[PDB]
Structure formats: C-alpha cells, structure tokens
Amino acid sequence: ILPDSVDWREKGCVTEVKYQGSCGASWAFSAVGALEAQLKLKTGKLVSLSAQNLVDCSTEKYGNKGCNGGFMTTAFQYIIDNKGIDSDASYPYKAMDQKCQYDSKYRAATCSKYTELPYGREDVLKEAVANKGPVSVGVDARHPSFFLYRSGVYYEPSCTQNVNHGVLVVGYGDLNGKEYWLVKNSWGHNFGEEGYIRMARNKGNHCGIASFPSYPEIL
Ligand SMILES: CS(=O)(=O)N1CCc2c(c(-c3ccc(Cl)c(C#Cc4ccc(CNCc5ccc(Cl)cc5)cc4)c3)nn2CCCN2CCN(C3CC3)CC2)C1
C-alpha cells in the first residue's frame, strides 16, 4: 500500500539544486543525486557527490561524452567499477570536460549495484520512489515550455517518450487532484520552483519520465 504523496526532501535525502551551466552533464547530476539519497539512507550523512568526477572519468568506455551527454546507468557502472566517487567539495564542478582526477583519498560514496525499471511503467516508478528512494530518469526536455516552466503541473502535448535530459524524481503527489512527479533539475534555482518541476504523472508516460528509470544501492 503506497502513500499518496512522497517528498524525499522532507526526509533529508536531497542536496541543494546544482547549476550545470554550459555543459550537458544533466546525466551526471541525475546519477549523483540518486546516490546521494542512498548514501544518506545508509550512513546518516548528506553530502553532495562529484558530478565532475563522472564527467571526467565515466567517458567512452561507458558510452558517455562528458558535456555532450551520457547515461545514468553507465555512470553507476563506472562508480561500481571504480570502487568509488569523490565528494563534490573535493572534486568541484567546472562545467567542462577535464582529465580524470579521481582520487580515492576523497571517496565519499560507493555503489554496489543499480536497478533499471521497466519502460513506461509509472506504477513501478511510484513504488520505487516510495520504497527505495529518489530515482534517476530521463525526460523529453526538447520543448520551450519545459525551459520556461515556473509553477503548476507541467503538461506539454507535443512531448514524446524519447528522453534527452537527466533529472531526479524525488517525490510525487497531486495538485488539486492533478497528479505529478516531483523532479529535481540541475539548471539552478531560477529554473522552475527553486530548481524543481512538477511533471504530469499517470498521463501515459508523459515526456518519457518512466522510459528509463534507474536507482543505485549501497550494501
Ligand atoms: C531516443 S530514446 O529516448 O529512445 N533513447 C535511446 C535509448 C536510450 C536512451 C537513454 C537515456 C536515458 C536517460 C537519459 Cl538522461 C539519456 C540522455 C541524455 C542526454 C542527451 C543529451 C545531452 C546534451 N544536451 C545538448 C548539449 C550538448 C552539449 C552541451 Cl555543452 C550542452 C548541451 C544530455 C543528456 C538517455 N537510455 N537509452 C538506453 C541505453 C542506451 N545505451 C546506453 C549505453 N550504450 C553504450 C554501451 C555504452 C548502450 C545502450 C535515449
């Protein structure tokens, strides 16, 4: 029996909204955000993890292209293979591709595995968000309405289920009975509601929010 609303910010599992600047690293921000929640769940500590670590080090071997895009799933695999990821403080974000400068001295988190969810299943995504934690997802953000979003529940008739932007589902609920996913973006505080966007939920995988969900775990 799933709760009617969740918001992982109220459980203290979500770090502040980041600003990716001129670097297509949304995939890296989505991935670290998910792992940040699990790190807090396991250890009690909330620490921002290094998106730049992923940009610089999870590259061609993982199908990732730094500031030209990438995938959260293969980002998690990098963290597994690498046996760690650095804190954001120690490996700060520069919004550009750099040489890999991972240093295990400043390792703030580990990843044992990750799980993908089945394509288009908003019911399964809801369960995972309720029971596991924030979930990394892709959305179709290729529409001016997305970029211009300020408040309310986002609905874009010309959205597709193809995804081109990584974000973090940190919750769900309804606004006056209009169901939504609570989504943490990485375009700073001036995007949406202090960096957050409510996106239509249970409208047939609107903007592909449930097309490619994934979350990591730490044992
Ligand atoms: C079409 S589809 O939706 O059907 N789909 C096709 C199939 C697909 C899509 C996504 C997916 C899921 C989540 C996200 Cl987030 C993304 C993404 C993204 C993205 C794209 C562009 C940008 C950059 N934006 C423009 C920009 C450029 C430069 C700058 Cl500086 C600034 C901005 C950022 C993020 C993709 N997973 N899979 C399935 C897995 C695909 N692989 C992953 C790894 N492989 C290689 C073996 C390594 C095999 C399989 C997309």
Side-chain angles (χ1 to χ4, degrees), residues 2-60 62-98 100-219:
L2 282 27
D4 285 341
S5 311
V6 323
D7 183 344
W8 283 102
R9 299 175 300 183
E10 299 161 356
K11 295 196 216 82
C13 295
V14 186
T15 68
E16 300 187 13
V17 164
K18 306 305 193 298
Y19 180 65
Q20 71 186 70
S22 293
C23 170
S26 67
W27 64 275
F29 286 100
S30 174
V32 297
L35 192 55
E36 288 160 10
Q38 299 298 319
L39 179 62
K40 163 76 192 42
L41 257 13
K42 194 211 171 58
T43 72
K45 309 292 137 206
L46 186 64
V47 16
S48 293
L49 306 176
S50 178
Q52 192 69 53
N53 194 168
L54 296 177
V55 169
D56 301 343
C57 310
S58 179
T59 58
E60 287 83 14
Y62 297 97
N64 293 333
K65 292 168 200 290
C67 294
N68 298 123
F71 306 88
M72 296 84 77
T73 52
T74 62
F76 298 135
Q77 194 60 58
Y78 162 80
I79 298 171
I80 295 161
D81 300 344
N82 197 62
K83 300 187 179 84
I85 185 169
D86 285 332
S87 70
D88 181 70
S90 72
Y91 197 159
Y93 180 71
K94 299 301 188 197
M96 55 198 311
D97 297 319
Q98 311 173 128
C100 177
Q101 297 153 70
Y102 176 69
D103 183 353
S104 61
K105 205 279 191 55
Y106 309 102
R107 182 183 72 241
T110 238
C111 179
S112 313
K113 53 173 274 197
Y114 70 96
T115 302
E116 300 180 4
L117 303 190
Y119 181 100
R121 293 292 297 278
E122 295 192 76
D123 59 329
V124 181
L125 183 55
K126 186 188 165 174
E127 188 177 7
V129 170
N131 292 339
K132 302 288 155 148
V135 176
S136 292
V137 302
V139 295
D140 183 2
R142 222 159 246 161
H143 302 281
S145 59
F146 187 91
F147 301 93
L148 297 168
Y149 170 88
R150 181 61 187 84
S151 68
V153 177
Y154 181 65
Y155 182 75
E156 174 45 67
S158 58
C159 251
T160 68
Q161 297 178 78
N162 303 322
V163 306
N164 44 52
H165 186 65
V167 294
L168 217 215
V169 180
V170 301
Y172 59 80
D174 67 278
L175 179 61
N176 300 310
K178 300 206 281 169
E179 289 181 328
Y180 68 87
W181 295 109
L182 186 60
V183 169
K184 188 195 190 195
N185 202 3
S186 58
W187 291 343
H189 292 345
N190 294 325
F191 171 81
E193 288 159 330
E194 218 76 46
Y196 287 84
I197 175 166
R198 302 180 141 76
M199 300 186 64
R201 175 165 68 92
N202 294 328
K203 303 267 179 304
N205 190 29
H206 182 253
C207 306
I209 192 141
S211 296
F212 301 97
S214 63
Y215 62 94
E217 280 171 286
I218 314 173
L219 173 70

Short mmCIF file of all heavy atoms in Angstrom, two decimals, residues 64-126, unseen atoms left out:
data_model
loop_
_atom_site.label_atom_id
_atom_site.label_comp_id
_atom_site.label_asym_id
_atom_site.label_seq_id
_atom_site.Cartn_x
_atom_site.Cartn_y
_atom_site.Cartn_z
N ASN A 64 29.64 7.53 -22.56
CA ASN A 64 29.35 8.88 -22.10
C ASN A 64 30.31 9.84 -22.78
O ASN A 64 31.42 9.47 -23.14
CB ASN A 64 29.48 8.94 -20.58
CG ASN A 64 28.41 8.13 -19.86
OD1 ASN A 64 27.32 7.92 -20.38
ND2 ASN A 64 28.73 7.65 -18.64
N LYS A 65 29.84 11.07 -22.98
CA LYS A 65 30.55 12.08 -23.76
C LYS A 65 30.68 13.38 -22.97
O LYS A 65 30.62 14.47 -23.53
CB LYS A 65 29.80 12.31 -25.07
CG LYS A 65 29.83 11.12 -26.04
CD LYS A 65 28.84 11.30 -27.18
CE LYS A 65 28.51 9.98 -27.84
NZ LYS A 65 29.69 9.46 -28.59
N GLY A 66 30.86 13.26 -21.65
CA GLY A 66 31.04 14.40 -20.75
C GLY A 66 29.97 15.46 -20.91
O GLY A 66 28.80 15.20 -20.68
N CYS A 67 30.38 16.66 -21.34
CA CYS A 67 29.47 17.78 -21.54
C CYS A 67 28.58 17.65 -22.80
O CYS A 67 27.69 18.48 -22.98
CB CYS A 67 30.22 19.11 -21.58
SG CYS A 67 31.00 19.58 -20.02
N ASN A 68 28.80 16.63 -23.63
CA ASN A 68 27.87 16.34 -24.74
C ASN A 68 26.85 15.25 -24.45
O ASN A 68 26.15 14.81 -25.35
CB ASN A 68 28.65 16.00 -26.01
CG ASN A 68 29.51 17.15 -26.48
OD1 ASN A 68 30.72 16.99 -26.63
ND2 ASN A 68 28.90 18.31 -26.69
N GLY A 69 26.75 14.82 -23.20
CA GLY A 69 25.69 13.91 -22.79
C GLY A 69 26.21 12.59 -22.30
O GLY A 69 27.41 12.33 -22.34
N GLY A 70 25.28 11.77 -21.84
CA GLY A 70 25.61 10.49 -21.22
C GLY A 70 24.40 9.84 -20.58
O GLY A 70 23.27 10.29 -20.77
N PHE A 71 24.65 8.80 -19.81
CA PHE A 71 23.61 7.95 -19.24
C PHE A 71 23.87 7.74 -17.75
O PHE A 71 25.02 7.55 -17.34
CB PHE A 71 23.57 6.61 -19.97
CG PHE A 71 23.44 6.73 -21.46
CD1 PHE A 71 24.57 6.86 -22.26
CD2 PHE A 71 22.18 6.76 -22.06
CE1 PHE A 71 24.45 6.99 -23.64
CE2 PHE A 71 22.06 6.91 -23.44
CZ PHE A 71 23.20 7.01 -24.23
N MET A 72 22.80 7.75 -16.96
CA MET A 72 22.92 7.48 -15.53
C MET A 72 23.30 6.04 -15.25
O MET A 72 24.08 5.77 -14.34
CB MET A 72 21.64 7.85 -14.80
CG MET A 72 21.33 9.34 -14.85
SD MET A 72 20.47 9.84 -16.35
CE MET A 72 18.84 9.27 -15.93
N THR A 73 22.77 5.10 -16.04
CA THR A 73 23.04 3.68 -15.80
C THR A 73 24.53 3.35 -15.90
O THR A 73 25.09 2.72 -15.01
CB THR A 73 22.23 2.76 -16.75
OG1 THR A 73 22.44 3.16 -18.10
CG2 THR A 73 20.76 2.85 -16.45
N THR A 74 25.17 3.82 -16.98
CA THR A 74 26.60 3.61 -17.18
C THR A 74 27.45 4.48 -16.25
O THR A 74 28.59 4.13 -15.96
CB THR A 74 27.02 3.87 -18.63
OG1 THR A 74 26.76 5.24 -18.96
CG2 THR A 74 26.28 2.94 -19.59
N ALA A 75 26.90 5.60 -15.79
CA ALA A 75 27.51 6.37 -14.71
C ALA A 75 27.58 5.55 -13.42
O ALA A 75 28.63 5.50 -12.78
CB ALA A 75 26.76 7.68 -14.46
N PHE A 76 26.49 4.88 -13.06
CA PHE A 76 26.50 4.00 -11.88
C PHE A 76 27.51 2.85 -12.06
O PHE A 76 28.22 2.51 -11.11
CB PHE A 76 25.11 3.42 -11.56
CG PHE A 76 24.08 4.47 -11.21
CD1 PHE A 76 22.80 4.42 -11.76
CD2 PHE A 76 24.38 5.51 -10.33
CE1 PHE A 76 21.86 5.39 -11.44
CE2 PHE A 76 23.45 6.47 -10.02
CZ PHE A 76 22.18 6.42 -10.58
N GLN A 77 27.58 2.30 -13.27
CA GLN A 77 28.53 1.22 -13.53
C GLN A 77 29.95 1.70 -13.32
O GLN A 77 30.73 0.99 -12.70
CB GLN A 77 28.37 0.63 -14.94
CG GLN A 77 29.11 -0.70 -15.14
CD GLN A 77 28.62 -1.79 -14.20
OE1 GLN A 77 27.43 -2.14 -14.20
NE2 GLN A 77 29.52 -2.32 -13.38
N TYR A 78 30.28 2.89 -13.81
CA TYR A 78 31.58 3.49 -13.52
C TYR A 78 31.87 3.53 -12.01
O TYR A 78 32.95 3.15 -11.58
CB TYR A 78 31.72 4.90 -14.10
CG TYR A 78 32.85 5.67 -13.46
CD1 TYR A 78 34.18 5.47 -13.86
CD2 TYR A 78 32.61 6.58 -12.42
CE1 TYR A 78 35.22 6.15 -13.27
CE2 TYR A 78 33.64 7.27 -11.82
CZ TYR A 78 34.95 7.05 -12.24
OH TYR A 78 35.97 7.74 -11.65
N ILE A 79 30.91 3.96 -11.22
CA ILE A 79 31.13 4.06 -9.77
C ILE A 79 31.37 2.67 -9.17
O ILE A 79 32.19 2.51 -8.27
CB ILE A 79 29.96 4.79 -9.06
CG1 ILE A 79 29.84 6.23 -9.58
CG2 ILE A 79 30.18 4.80 -7.54
CD1 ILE A 79 28.61 6.97 -9.10
N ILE A 80 30.65 1.67 -9.68
CA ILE A 80 30.86 0.28 -9.28
C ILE A 80 32.28 -0.14 -9.65
O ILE A 80 33.06 -0.52 -8.79
CB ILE A 80 29.82 -0.67 -9.91
CG1 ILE A 80 28.40 -0.37 -9.39
CG2 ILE A 80 30.18 -2.13 -9.61
CD1 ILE A 80 27.28 -0.93 -10.25
N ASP A 81 32.63 -0.03 -10.93
CA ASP A 81 33.96 -0.44 -11.42
C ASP A 81 35.10 0.29 -10.70
O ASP A 81 36.09 -0.32 -10.32
CB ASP A 81 34.09 -0.18 -12.92
CG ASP A 81 33.06 -0.93 -13.76
OD1 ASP A 81 32.41 -1.87 -13.26
OD2 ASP A 81 32.89 -0.54 -14.93
N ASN A 82 34.91 1.59 -10.49
CA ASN A 82 35.91 2.45 -9.88
C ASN A 82 36.04 2.24 -8.38
O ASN A 82 36.98 2.75 -7.79
CB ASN A 82 35.56 3.91 -10.15
CG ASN A 82 36.73 4.84 -9.94
OD1 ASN A 82 37.74 4.72 -10.62
ND2 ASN A 82 36.60 5.76 -8.98
N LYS A 83 35.09 1.53 -7.76
CA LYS A 83 35.02 1.37 -6.31
C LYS A 83 34.93 2.72 -5.56
O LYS A 83 35.39 2.85 -4.42
CB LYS A 83 36.18 0.49 -5.78
CG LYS A 83 36.20 -0.92 -6.37
CD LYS A 83 37.25 -1.80 -5.69
CE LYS A 83 37.26 -3.22 -6.25
NZ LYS A 83 38.10 -3.27 -7.48
N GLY A 84 34.30 3.72 -6.19
CA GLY A 84 34.01 4.96 -5.51
C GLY A 84 33.71 6.18 -6.36
O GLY A 84 33.90 6.18 -7.57
N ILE A 85 33.23 7.21 -5.68
CA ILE A 85 33.05 8.52 -6.27
C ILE A 85 33.46 9.55 -5.22
O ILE A 85 33.21 9.36 -4.04
CB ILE A 85 31.60 8.73 -6.79
CG1 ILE A 85 31.49 10.08 -7.52
CG2 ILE A 85 30.59 8.64 -5.67
CD1 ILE A 85 30.21 10.28 -8.29
N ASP A 86 34.13 10.60 -5.67
CA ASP A 86 34.58 11.69 -4.79
C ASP A 86 33.42 12.60 -4.42
O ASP A 86 32.45 12.74 -5.17
CB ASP A 86 35.68 12.53 -5.46
CG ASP A 86 37.03 11.82 -5.48
OD1 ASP A 86 37.27 11.00 -4.56
OD2 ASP A 86 37.85 12.07 -6.38
N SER A 87 33.56 13.25 -3.27
CA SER A 87 32.65 14.32 -2.85
C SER A 87 32.75 15.47 -3.84
O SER A 87 33.78 15.65 -4.49
CB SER A 87 33.02 14.83 -1.45
OG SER A 87 34.26 15.55 -1.45
N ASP A 88 31.69 16.25 -3.95
CA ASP A 88 31.68 17.45 -4.78
C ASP A 88 32.68 18.46 -4.23
O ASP A 88 33.34 19.14 -5.01
CB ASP A 88 30.28 18.05 -4.83
CG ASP A 88 30.19 19.29 -5.69
OD1 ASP A 88 30.30 19.20 -6.91
OD2 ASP A 88 30.01 20.37 -5.12
N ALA A 89 32.80 18.57 -2.91
CA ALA A 89 33.73 19.54 -2.30
C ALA A 89 35.16 19.32 -2.77
O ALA A 89 35.85 20.27 -3.11
CB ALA A 89 33.66 19.48 -0.77
N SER A 90 35.58 18.06 -2.81
CA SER A 90 36.95 17.69 -3.15
C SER A 90 37.23 17.66 -4.65
O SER A 90 38.37 17.82 -5.08
CB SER A 90 37.27 16.32 -2.56
OG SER A 90 36.59 15.27 -3.28
N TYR A 91 36.18 17.42 -5.45
CA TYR A 91 36.31 17.34 -6.90
C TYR A 91 35.20 18.22 -7.49
O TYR A 91 34.22 17.73 -8.05
CB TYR A 91 36.21 15.88 -7.33
CG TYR A 91 36.70 15.55 -8.73
CD1 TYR A 91 37.06 14.24 -9.06
CD2 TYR A 91 36.77 16.53 -9.75
CE1 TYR A 91 37.50 13.91 -10.34
CE2 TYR A 91 37.21 16.20 -11.03
CZ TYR A 91 37.56 14.89 -11.31
OH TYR A 91 37.99 14.56 -12.57
N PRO A 92 35.37 19.55 -7.36
CA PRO A 92 34.32 20.51 -7.69
C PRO A 92 33.96 20.57 -9.17
O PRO A 92 34.75 20.14 -10.03
CB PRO A 92 34.91 21.85 -7.21
CG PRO A 92 36.37 21.66 -7.36
CD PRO A 92 36.61 20.24 -6.96
N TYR A 93 32.76 21.09 -9.43
CA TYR A 93 32.19 21.13 -10.77
C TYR A 93 32.63 22.39 -11.50
O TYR A 93 32.53 23.49 -10.97
CB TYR A 93 30.66 21.06 -10.70
CG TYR A 93 29.98 21.11 -12.04
CD1 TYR A 93 30.03 20.02 -12.92
CD2 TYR A 93 29.26 22.24 -12.43
CE1 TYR A 93 29.40 20.06 -14.14
CE2 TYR A 93 28.63 22.29 -13.65
CZ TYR A 93 28.68 21.19 -14.50
OH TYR A 93 28.04 21.23 -15.73
N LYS A 94 33.09 22.19 -12.73
CA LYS A 94 33.66 23.23 -13.57
C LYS A 94 32.94 23.46 -14.88
O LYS A 94 33.38 24.30 -15.68
CB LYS A 94 35.12 22.85 -13.87
CG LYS A 94 36.00 22.73 -12.64
CD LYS A 94 36.03 24.05 -11.87
CE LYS A 94 37.04 24.05 -10.75
NZ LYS A 94 36.72 25.17 -9.83
N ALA A 95 31.86 22.71 -15.14
CA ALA A 95 31.12 22.82 -16.39
C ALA A 95 31.99 22.72 -17.65
O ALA A 95 31.77 23.43 -18.63
CB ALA A 95 30.29 24.10 -16.40
N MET A 96 32.98 21.83 -17.61
CA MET A 96 33.75 21.50 -18.80
C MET A 96 34.40 20.15 -18.65
O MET A 96 34.52 19.64 -17.55
CB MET A 96 34.77 22.59 -19.17
CG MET A 96 35.77 23.00 -18.12
SD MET A 96 36.51 24.62 -18.55
CE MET A 96 36.98 24.40 -20.27
N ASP A 97 34.76 19.56 -19.78
CA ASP A 97 35.48 18.29 -19.81
C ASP A 97 36.92 18.52 -19.37
O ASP A 97 37.57 19.46 -19.85
CB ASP A 97 35.47 17.66 -21.21
CG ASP A 97 34.08 17.32 -21.70
OD1 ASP A 97 33.26 16.83 -20.91
OD2 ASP A 97 33.78 17.55 -22.87
N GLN A 98 37.38 17.69 -18.45
CA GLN A 98 38.75 17.76 -17.95
C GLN A 98 39.31 16.35 -17.94
O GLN A 98 38.57 15.40 -18.15
CB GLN A 98 38.78 18.32 -16.52
CG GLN A 98 38.00 19.59 -16.27
CD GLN A 98 37.95 19.97 -14.79
OE1 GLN A 98 38.27 21.10 -14.42
NE2 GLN A 98 37.57 19.01 -13.93
N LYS A 99 40.61 16.23 -17.68
CA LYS A 99 41.25 14.95 -17.40
C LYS A 99 40.64 14.36 -16.15
O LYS A 99 40.21 15.09 -15.24
CB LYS A 99 42.77 15.10 -17.20
N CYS A 100 40.59 13.03 -16.09
CA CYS A 100 40.07 12.35 -14.93
C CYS A 100 41.02 12.59 -13.76
O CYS A 100 42.22 12.33 -13.87
CB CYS A 100 39.92 10.86 -15.20
SG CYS A 100 39.36 9.94 -13.75
N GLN A 101 40.49 13.12 -12.66
CA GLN A 101 41.30 13.43 -11.50
C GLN A 101 40.72 12.78 -10.25
O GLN A 101 40.89 13.27 -9.15
CB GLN A 101 41.42 14.95 -11.34
CG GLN A 101 42.15 15.63 -12.49
CD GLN A 101 41.72 17.07 -12.69
OE1 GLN A 101 42.02 17.94 -11.87
NE2 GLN A 101 41.02 17.33 -13.79
N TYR A 102 40.08 11.63 -10.42
CA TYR A 102 39.60 10.85 -9.30
C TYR A 102 40.75 10.59 -8.33
O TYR A 102 41.86 10.29 -8.74
CB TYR A 102 39.04 9.50 -9.73
CG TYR A 102 38.64 8.64 -8.56
CD1 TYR A 102 37.54 8.98 -7.77
CD2 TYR A 102 39.39 7.50 -8.20
CE1 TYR A 102 37.17 8.20 -6.68
CE2 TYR A 102 39.02 6.72 -7.11
CZ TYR A 102 37.92 7.07 -6.36
OH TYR A 102 37.54 6.29 -5.29
N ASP A 103 40.44 10.71 -7.05
CA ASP A 103 41.38 10.40 -6.00
C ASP A 103 40.62 9.73 -4.89
O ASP A 103 39.78 10.37 -4.25
CB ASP A 103 42.04 11.68 -5.50
CG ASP A 103 43.09 11.41 -4.46
OD1 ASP A 103 43.26 10.26 -4.00
OD2 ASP A 103 43.74 12.40 -4.07
N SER A 104 40.93 8.45 -4.64
CA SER A 104 40.20 7.66 -3.65
C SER A 104 40.35 8.21 -2.23
O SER A 104 39.53 7.90 -1.36
CB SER A 104 40.66 6.20 -3.68
OG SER A 104 42.05 6.10 -3.37
N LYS A 105 41.37 9.03 -1.99
CA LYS A 105 41.51 9.74 -0.72
C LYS A 105 40.21 10.45 -0.32
O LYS A 105 39.81 10.39 0.83
CB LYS A 105 42.67 10.74 -0.81
CG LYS A 105 43.34 11.13 0.50
CD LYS A 105 42.57 12.19 1.26
CE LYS A 105 43.38 12.77 2.43
NZ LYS A 105 44.71 13.31 2.04
N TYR A 106 39.55 11.09 -1.28
CA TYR A 106 38.33 11.86 -1.02
C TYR A 106 37.02 11.13 -1.42
O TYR A 106 35.97 11.76 -1.58
CB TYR A 106 38.45 13.22 -1.71
CG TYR A 106 39.74 13.94 -1.36
CD1 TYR A 106 40.83 13.96 -2.25
CD2 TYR A 106 39.87 14.58 -0.13
CE1 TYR A 106 42.01 14.61 -1.92
CE2 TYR A 106 41.06 15.24 0.21
CZ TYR A 106 42.12 15.25 -0.69
OH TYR A 106 43.29 15.88 -0.35
N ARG A 107 37.09 9.81 -1.56
CA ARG A 107 35.95 8.96 -1.84
C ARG A 107 34.88 9.22 -0.78
O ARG A 107 35.15 9.04 0.39
CB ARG A 107 36.36 7.46 -1.82
CG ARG A 107 35.19 6.53 -2.16
CD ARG A 107 35.54 5.06 -2.07
NE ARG A 107 35.71 4.65 -0.68
CZ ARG A 107 36.82 4.15 -0.12
NH1 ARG A 107 37.93 3.97 -0.84
NH2 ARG A 107 36.82 3.83 1.18
N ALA A 108 33.70 9.66 -1.21
CA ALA A 108 32.58 9.91 -0.29
C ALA A 108 31.47 8.84 -0.38
O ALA A 108 30.58 8.78 0.48
CB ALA A 108 32.00 11.29 -0.57
N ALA A 109 31.49 8.04 -1.43
CA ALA A 109 30.45 7.04 -1.61
C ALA A 109 30.88 5.92 -2.51
O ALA A 109 31.80 6.06 -3.32
CB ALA A 109 29.15 7.66 -2.16
N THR A 110 30.16 4.83 -2.37
CA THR A 110 30.39 3.62 -3.11
C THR A 110 29.04 3.24 -3.74
O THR A 110 28.00 3.78 -3.34
CB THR A 110 31.00 2.59 -2.13
OG1 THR A 110 32.27 2.18 -2.64
CG2 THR A 110 30.12 1.42 -1.84
N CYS A 111 29.05 2.35 -4.73
CA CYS A 111 27.83 1.82 -5.32
C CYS A 111 28.00 0.31 -5.52
O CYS A 111 28.95 -0.12 -6.19
CB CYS A 111 27.54 2.50 -6.66
SG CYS A 111 26.06 1.89 -7.50
N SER A 112 27.10 -0.48 -4.94
CA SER A 112 27.17 -1.95 -5.04
C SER A 112 26.56 -2.44 -6.36
O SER A 112 27.04 -3.41 -6.95
CB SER A 112 26.40 -2.59 -3.87
OG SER A 112 26.74 -1.98 -2.62
N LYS A 113 25.50 -1.76 -6.80
CA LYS A 113 24.70 -2.16 -7.94
C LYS A 113 23.72 -1.05 -8.28
O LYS A 113 23.57 -0.10 -7.52
CB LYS A 113 23.91 -3.42 -7.62
CG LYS A 113 23.08 -3.32 -6.34
CD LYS A 113 22.18 -4.54 -6.15
CE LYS A 113 20.86 -4.40 -6.88
NZ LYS A 113 19.87 -5.37 -6.36
N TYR A 114 23.06 -1.20 -9.42
CA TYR A 114 21.91 -0.39 -9.75
C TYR A 114 20.83 -1.24 -10.39
O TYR A 114 21.09 -2.33 -10.87
CB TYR A 114 22.31 0.78 -10.65
CG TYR A 114 22.70 0.39 -12.05
CD1 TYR A 114 21.78 0.44 -13.08
CD2 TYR A 114 24.00 -0.02 -12.34
CE1 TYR A 114 22.13 0.09 -14.38
CE2 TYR A 114 24.37 -0.37 -13.63
CZ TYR A 114 23.42 -0.32 -14.64
OH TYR A 114 23.76 -0.64 -15.93
N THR A 115 19.61 -0.73 -10.36
CA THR A 115 18.44 -1.40 -10.89
C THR A 115 17.79 -0.47 -11.89
O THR A 115 17.60 0.71 -11.61
CB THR A 115 17.46 -1.69 -9.74
OG1 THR A 115 18.11 -2.49 -8.76
CG2 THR A 115 16.21 -2.42 -10.23
N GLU A 116 17.44 -1.01 -13.05
CA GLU A 116 16.63 -0.31 -14.03
C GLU A 116 15.17 -0.71 -13.84
O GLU A 116 14.89 -1.83 -13.43
CB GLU A 116 17.06 -0.67 -15.46
CG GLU A 116 18.50 -0.33 -15.77
CD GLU A 116 18.93 -0.69 -17.18
OE1 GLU A 116 18.10 -1.15 -18.00
OE2 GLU A 116 20.12 -0.52 -17.47
N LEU A 117 14.26 0.20 -14.16
CA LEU A 117 12.84 -0.07 -14.10
C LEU A 117 12.30 -0.27 -15.50
O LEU A 117 12.90 0.20 -16.48
CB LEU A 117 12.10 1.07 -13.42
CG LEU A 117 12.56 1.41 -12.00
CD1 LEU A 117 11.58 2.38 -11.38
CD2 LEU A 117 12.70 0.18 -11.12
N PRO A 118 11.16 -0.98 -15.62
CA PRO A 118 10.62 -1.27 -16.95
C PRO A 118 10.05 -0.02 -17.62
O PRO A 118 9.40 0.82 -16.96
CB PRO A 118 9.53 -2.32 -16.68
CG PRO A 118 9.20 -2.19 -15.24
CD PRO A 118 10.44 -1.71 -14.56
N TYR A 119 10.31 0.09 -18.91
CA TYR A 119 9.94 1.23 -19.73
C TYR A 119 8.45 1.57 -19.63
O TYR A 119 7.60 0.72 -19.84
CB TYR A 119 10.30 0.93 -21.18
CG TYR A 119 10.02 2.02 -22.19
CD1 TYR A 119 11.03 2.86 -22.64
CD2 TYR A 119 8.75 2.18 -22.74
CE1 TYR A 119 10.80 3.83 -23.60
CE2 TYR A 119 8.50 3.17 -23.69
CZ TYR A 119 9.53 3.98 -24.12
OH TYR A 119 9.30 4.96 -25.07
N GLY A 120 8.16 2.84 -19.34
CA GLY A 120 6.80 3.37 -19.35
C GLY A 120 5.94 3.02 -18.15
O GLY A 120 4.77 3.41 -18.11
N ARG A 121 6.48 2.31 -17.17
CA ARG A 121 5.70 1.85 -16.03
C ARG A 121 5.72 2.87 -14.90
O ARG A 121 6.63 2.86 -14.06
CB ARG A 121 6.16 0.47 -15.56
CG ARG A 121 5.89 -0.65 -16.57
CD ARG A 121 4.41 -0.94 -16.73
NE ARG A 121 3.84 -1.42 -15.47
CZ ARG A 121 3.90 -2.68 -15.03
NH1 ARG A 121 4.52 -3.63 -15.74
NH2 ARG A 121 3.35 -3.00 -13.86
N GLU A 122 4.72 3.75 -14.90
CA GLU A 122 4.62 4.79 -13.88
C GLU A 122 4.22 4.23 -12.52
O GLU A 122 4.53 4.82 -11.48
CB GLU A 122 3.66 5.88 -14.34
CG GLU A 122 4.15 6.62 -15.55
CD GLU A 122 3.36 7.88 -15.85
OE1 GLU A 122 3.55 8.90 -15.14
OE2 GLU A 122 2.56 7.87 -16.83
N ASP A 123 3.54 3.08 -12.52
CA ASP A 123 3.18 2.39 -11.29
C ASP A 123 4.40 1.80 -10.60
O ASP A 123 4.50 1.84 -9.37
CB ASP A 123 2.12 1.29 -11.53
CG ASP A 123 2.57 0.22 -12.54
OD1 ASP A 123 3.35 0.51 -13.47
OD2 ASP A 123 2.11 -0.93 -12.40
N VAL A 124 5.33 1.28 -11.40
CA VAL A 124 6.55 0.69 -10.85
C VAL A 124 7.47 1.81 -10.36
O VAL A 124 8.12 1.68 -9.32
CB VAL A 124 7.27 -0.24 -11.86
CG1 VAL A 124 8.53 -0.84 -11.24
CG2 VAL A 124 6.35 -1.37 -12.30
N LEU A 125 7.52 2.91 -11.11
CA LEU A 125 8.29 4.09 -10.69
C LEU A 125 7.79 4.64 -9.35
O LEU A 125 8.60 5.01 -8.49
CB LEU A 125 8.26 5.18 -11.75
CG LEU A 125 9.07 6.46 -11.50
CD1 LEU A 125 10.52 6.16 -11.21
CD2 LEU A 125 8.96 7.40 -12.68
N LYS A 126 6.48 4.69 -9.18
CA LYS A 126 5.88 5.17 -7.94
C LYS A 126 6.33 4.31 -6.75
O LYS A 126 6.76 4.84 -5.73
CB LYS A 126 4.35 5.17 -8.06
CG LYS A 126 3.63 5.79 -6.88
CD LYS A 126 2.13 5.58 -6.94
CE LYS A 126 1.53 5.89 -5.59
NZ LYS A 126 0.05 5.88 -5.49
#
